[PDB]
Amino acid sequence: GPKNVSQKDAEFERTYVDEVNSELVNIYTFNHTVTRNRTEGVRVSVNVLNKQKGAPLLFVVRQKEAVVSFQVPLILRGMFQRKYLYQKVERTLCQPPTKNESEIQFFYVDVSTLSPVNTTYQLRVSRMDDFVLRTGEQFSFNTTAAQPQYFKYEFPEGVDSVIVKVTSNKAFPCSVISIQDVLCPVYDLDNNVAFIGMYQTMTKKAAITVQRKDFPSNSFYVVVVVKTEDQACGGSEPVDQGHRQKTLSVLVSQAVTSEAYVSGMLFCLGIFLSFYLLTVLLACWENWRAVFYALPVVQLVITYQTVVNVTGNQDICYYNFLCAHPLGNLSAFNNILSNLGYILLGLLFLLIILQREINHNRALLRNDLCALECGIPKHFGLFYAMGTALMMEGLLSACYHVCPNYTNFQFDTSFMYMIAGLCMLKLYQKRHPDSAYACLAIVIFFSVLGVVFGKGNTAFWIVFSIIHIIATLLLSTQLYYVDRMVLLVMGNVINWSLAAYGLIMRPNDFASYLLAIGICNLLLYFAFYIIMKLRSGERIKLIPLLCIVCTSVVWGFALFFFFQGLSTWQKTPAESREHNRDCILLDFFDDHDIWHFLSSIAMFGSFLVLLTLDDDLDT
Amino acid sequence: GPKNVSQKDAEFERTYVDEVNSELVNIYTFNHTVTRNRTEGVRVSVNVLNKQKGAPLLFVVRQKEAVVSFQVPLILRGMFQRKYLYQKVERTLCQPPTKNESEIQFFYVDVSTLSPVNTTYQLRVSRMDDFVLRTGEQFSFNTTAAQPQYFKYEFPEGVDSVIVKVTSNKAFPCSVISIQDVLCPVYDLDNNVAFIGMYQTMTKKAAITVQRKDFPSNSFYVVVVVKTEDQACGGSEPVDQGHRQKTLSVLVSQAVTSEAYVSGMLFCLGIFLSFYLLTVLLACWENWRAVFYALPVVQLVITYQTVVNVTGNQDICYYNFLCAHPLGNLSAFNNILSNLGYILLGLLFLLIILQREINHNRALLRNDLCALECGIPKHFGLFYAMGTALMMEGLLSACYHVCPNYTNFQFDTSFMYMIAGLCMLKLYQKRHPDSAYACLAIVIFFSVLGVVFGKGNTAFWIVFSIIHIIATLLLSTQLYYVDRMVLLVMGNVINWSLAAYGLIMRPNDFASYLLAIGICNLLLYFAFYIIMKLRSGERIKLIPLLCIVCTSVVWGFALFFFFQGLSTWQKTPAESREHNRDCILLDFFDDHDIWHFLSSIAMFGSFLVLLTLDDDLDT
Ligand SMILES: *[C@@H]1O[C@H](CO)[C@@H](O[C@@H]2O[C@H](CO)[C@@H](O)[C@H](O)[C@H]2NC(C)=O)[C@H](O)[C@H]1NC(C)=O
Ligand SMILES: *[C@@H]1O[C@H](CO)[C@@H](O[C@@H]2O[C@H](CO)[C@@H](O)[C@H](O)[C@H]2NC(C)=O)[C@H](O)[C@H]1NC(C)=O
Ligand SMILES: *[C@@H]1O[C@H](CO)[C@@H](O[C@@H]2O[C@H](CO)[C@@H](O)[C@H](O)[C@H]2NC(C)=O)[C@H](O)[C@H]1NC(C)=O
Ligand SMILES: *[C@@H]1O[C@H](CO)[C@@H](O[C@@H]2O[C@H](CO)[C@@H](O)[C@H](O)[C@H]2NC(C)=O)[C@H](O)[C@H]1NC(C)=O
Ligand SMILES: *[C@@H]1O[C@H](CO)[C@@H](O)[C@H](O)[C@H]1NC(C)=O
Ligand SMILES: *[C@@H]1O[C@H](CO)[C@@H](O)[C@H](O)[C@H]1NC(C)=O
Ligand SMILES: *[C@@H]1O[C@H](CO)[C@@H](O)[C@H](O)[C@H]1NC(C)=O
Ligand SMILES: *[C@@H]1O[C@H](CO)[C@@H](O)[C@H](O)[C@H]1NC(C)=O
Ligand SMILES: *[C@@H]1O[C@H](CO)[C@@H](O)[C@H](O)[C@H]1NC(C)=O
Ligand SMILES: *[C@@H]1O[C@H](CO)[C@@H](O)[C@H](O)[C@H]1NC(C)=O
Ligand SMILES: [Zn+2]
Ligand SMILES: [Zn+2]
């Protein structure tokens, strides 16, 4: 007649080799017994042998309630009208749940083409024996840009959230890992995948935190889809592309139940309400025996945070996805407690100055002669800024850590130098009792130029490297005697030891690097201040000296953890996600959160250097 | 046998009514003669009559080089697992260009289902006689969420850019208008549409500017896709949804060729190099006859601008899409020249102060007695700020107008009050020659609270309304005699006339509204300053008075155009795009760009009030 329609009764796990004309159509009738409980996923797999350029095979999979139709050799899209041609196509068949416990279910495969030559294909329908994922058990597979895959997970009895971790041992097939509910169809194509769910482009690691209140089915599909071009991960006639494949590994493990939150917050209070206990008991017994930054920052952040929450495109906020414990609508709630050190110490510092000035004033009322002529003259208008600034660093970082990003970046660390600036100002306002804000603004502007060029050319880096060493020998002679020539020994080597470290690494983060120059230069001056006392008639009581060794150590651990993550921020969040790590402390905090703890203790303990350093000069 | 396969030879523009079992499949063989030049688009259309709940029809359209397969009644997705069921499906068939001038082309339709009851459908394949769009000719059609449509445009001989304008007379089907190249397939589904191209959610208006350098085919497809739920436009068992349809209208018109740019830029220079000409000729003949805002602003903007340029999601930047002439990578280049008034007048102002102070200093060298005791004492450290501030308002608005948005919003107008503040400070520093920055920061913070609540509840508005009238009677008695009680007459009514206007409209924009309070309150004080002179022995020369009438008028036109668009910024850029308008002046500038022109002339002409107002007090 017009055409030829052949109706074979097909079988699972067998390979059929056949031929189709422009005048022949093949229909295969597969059938499987589905069970309500032990769902198994069917998976079709076709492969056209030595196809010419004439006309594709057209494959239709007809279930009871869905039609899925593709054409082999599949042709996929590049950026600039580039085409890729895959000879081998695979697809898992979505199928909805059943009201009966077990029932027989049919589906048909229809193979046809409109080319006048006998095309030979290779059809094999095989059942998946590893569909449903199990909690805490690794699993490996393969996928290409023509053969997307997806697996099922269903939450156990009494697990309210999991974290789907997917890893790969190599870089450049670029996968997308979407997470979708269990209602057919499954959006596992390059165009479909971004439609719904909450995805994550991966290169070596992806981690998605899932909570079963969003899934009334108590289950979800994990969908892995490779991409034709690697531009979104930092890479560089149809072009056959079947030679490019990706091996992966998926592990689903339960998240922290509820105690890591309670035992995490009872750790911040336990070591900062400890200082309040300590100083009060130390002071009591012994004695008688800015807004211009608050406004623009926050309202951008609230706008930016909800975007992912309402879109599920997790390439926006540069969290540490392996340790990011959500609470409410906050996706990294453990990076916000970490900023309790500033809010609880920058305030405690102010209380110290209050009573210090209040205790002082009574001496004038007592008509003390010392208060008028003995000791360095009082100036507590700068201490009230250091105490104020610290409290404002734990508020512009708690707002940065709601979506860390290239845009949001300057908010925290730029204000950090201000704190370091006041320490530099106070020492110079001490010895020479008779401005720098431009330099802090310049540094921010330089970091802004270092923000417009953070991944800037290495030519820019050596420009900064050269300029820094010029400013190294410039400020060297500003404060310049055997002891004086001792200064330039370390004052120039340490800066060399840092600028050189820049070229060896070229951290994509810049402002955070300048912070390293900040302390590493400043911390030297403290010694330069102390060596003045030791090599003169000046002395040190045990109260200030004790606050010198301790704070010189907490600046050691802090600068260690501040270095544990320094390159853990790159372009293309897919690359920046390769560096995430599990939670070190209490399984709630990681390296960075330790830095927010140690920095606030390093700084507060260096304020109480200045406060009591020149307190032996009273008499 | 196993099934029944019927092979009909079908015909165009006829309606076939047939039945299918779980044991019958229909195959229709359509054929059309395609021509290289006059491409016509085929369009299938199926409709299932009184379908039960059992099992869908499955439709496959098999061309020579593509398979398109759906299932009727189509089921579409809501937000929270809501399903919608369409009984009627339509689709235009994509088909690639032909190497022959004209050739016969076949395609098959396959109708089959797996339900055991005779389902009756209604298949009609009809050719489209209005496929290819023509330049400058309106065109109307219809579409639903099951029947997406797309049309073709190909650029004429010598037209380098067009603007696709689509309008609708009603609001709430939410369409998406993508623009894609002419390579099959066409992504005209809810999931596909966002994949590639450059789309725009519409409610009443959409306008996409297209440039044929991005399309080597010299043509593109305009794709219209309705949406099931109206949430993205501000709205509120499967639920049958075929009763909801959208009528549209598409007009493609050529953009400004090249002269609107040259004749636009030769308009900014012609009226600001005019002032330089004017004042120099007026002065010469007659006489002898901050950085803390530059850094955070810009680098966010460059990051934000390229996102649309690399994604084509034009619901991000709140341009005026009907008048937005691109140049380079800037999408609204006519909103950036408009800010040449500040850069060219805030600088000219400084030149005035220079020679004013330079001419002054020689009087002291000449040992003039007047310069020491006659006239109000000189203080040009505040004028050098007003001249500096103006130049910095035409730089934080030229950076805002690269993507206007809720986040980017505060950059320009917040700094505007600073300029108004110095004018208020100068007058009070004049009469009382012996701070407000907190109020400007508070206003920004209040506008920040008005930014966190811009669309805030009307309860918030009346709070501001009540508080403003309290501050109306508060500052009234600060500066308080028949003339003194004249002050409170207008000083309180005008503020009432504004706060009341707020409740009648409740503009979603807030900071811009506060600007209206800014001038409308400030502008009254100028009169309050002038009425002091007129009702005393004080006088006015013709040089200052001339600069009073003129600047009181340019504050009339400016506040007119500043009101022509005040609600033209809402939530959901689909709604905010209903308010766009064509270009008024030179077909390059619109209402807002006139405001950037008149504001800079209104301000500069009010500085030269203060400069020369009290210049009759010399002797
Ligand atoms: C369902 O498919 C199976 C194939 O897996 C069919 O079972 C075959 O039946 C034939 C005829 O008796 C025998 O070769 C075997 O019993 C089966 N073949 C196998 C297991 O390879 C079965 O007929 C199909 N069901 C229906 C209703 O057609
Ligand atoms: C993924 O693909 C790789 C091939 O790239 C598979 O590795 C092959 O299969 C087994 C397992 O090692 C060996 O017998 C072959 O020699 C392997 N080939 C190579 C080149 O290594 C791997 O098994 C696949 N992963 C699966 C099936 O889970
Ligand atoms: C292409 O389709 C057309 C239908 O539009 C077929 O033309 C029909 O041919 C029959 C047989 O002679 C006659 O009824 C008319 O000539 C046509 N019917 C119409 C116009 O309604 C034509 O046969 C098809 N071509 C092929 C090769 O099958
Ligand atoms: C879009 O649909 C409307 C119906 O909602 C069509 O209007 C109908 O068709 C013609 C044109 O006015 C009239 O004879 C009918 O009475 C109209 N019905 C109603 C209720 O107004 C309109 O024609 C369609 N647009 C097209 C086909 O371009
Ligand atoms: C296939 O078509 C040919 C026509 O040449 C003829 O043998 C018959 O119609 C069909 N036979 C089979 C086995 O399909
Ligand atoms: C199982 O499914 C069949 C349809 O194949 C249906 O007729 C039957 O009612 C179902 N079982 C029960 C217990 O309802
Ligand atoms: C293959 O093509 C030949 C034409 O040479 C034709 O006779 C034959 O029927 C086709 N199919 C097979 C299975 O040989
Ligand atoms: C349809 O199937 C029936 C079987 O009951 C039989 O008439 C024949 O096989 C087929 N007839 C037609 C016209 O398709
Ligand atoms: C027109 O198309 C046919 C295929 O149907 C092809 O054989 C022929 O070569 C084409 N015409 C020319 C001039 O190449
Ligand atoms: C409709 O269903 C009946 C069963 O009652 C069956 O006999 C018949 O073949 C079906 N088709 C038509 C066209 O009547
Ligand atoms: Zn931090
Ligand atoms: Zn503006």
Residue numbers in the entry:
A (entry chain B), B (entry chain A): 24 to 259, 269 to 321, 457 to 601, 608 to 653, 685 to 823
Text lifted from the article:
The systemic RNAi-defective (SID) transmembrane family member 2 (SIDT2) is a putative nucleic acid channel or transporter that plays essential roles in nucleic acid transport and lipid metabolism. Here, we report the cryo-electron microscopy (EM) structures of human SIDT2, which forms a tightly packed dimer with extensive interactions mediated by two previously uncharacterized extracellular/luminal β-strand-rich domains and the unique transmembrane domain (TMD). The TMD of each SIDT2 protomer contains eleven transmembrane helices (TMs), and no discernible nucleic acid conduction pathway has been identified within the TMD, suggesting that it may act as a transporter. Notably, SIDT2 can hydrolyze C18 ceramide into sphingosine and fatty acid with a slow rate.
As SIDT2 localizes to the plasma membrane and late endosomal and lysosomal membrane with different pH environments, Condition 1 (the apo state in pH 7.4, hereafter apoSIDT2-pH 7.4) and Condition 2 (the apo state in pH 5.5, hereafter apoSIDT2-pH 5.5) were used to investigate whether the structure of SIDT2 is affected by pH conditions. The apoSIDT2-pH 7.4, apoSIDT2-pH 5.5, and SIDT2-pH 5.5 plus miRNA structures were determined at overall resolutions of 3.16 Å, 3.21 Å, and 2.87 Å, respectively. The cytoplasmic domain (CTD) was invisible in the maps of apoSIDT2-pH 7.4 and apoSIDT2-pH 5.5, reflecting intrinsic flexibility.
